[PDB]
């Protein structure tokens, strides 16, 4: 409404980048049409993840980058967002860090 950091990819984009590694019981033919936006969160390391998947709107979750950091350090490669898309650790932190904290 008033007239701003973020990153707008799909699917098939962080594939590509090695950020996502699966998504349960999607063909990768649909990866096009999943959609994710990260945007900063209301607290330091704090990430808002928004997405839509094939269309429908999902409910805005938050990453906290002392998360990752905690499932790095435990040698956790993954972690699921939205219950069924498993990301790697290693290349999320990468990506946050690239496109954020740098």
Known sequence: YFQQPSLHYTAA?????????????????????????????????????????????????????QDLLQLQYEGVAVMKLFNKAKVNVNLLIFLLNKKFLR
């Not at 063909?27 to 900063?40: G, L």
């Open 13 to 65: 984009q962080l594939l590509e980048k090695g950020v996502l590694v699966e998504i349960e019981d999607l063909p990768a033919s649909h990866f096009r049409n999943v959609i994710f936006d990260i945007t900063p969160g209301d607290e330091a390391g704090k990430f808002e993840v928004n997405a839509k998947f094939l269309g429908v709107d999902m409910e805005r979750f938050q990453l906290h980058y």
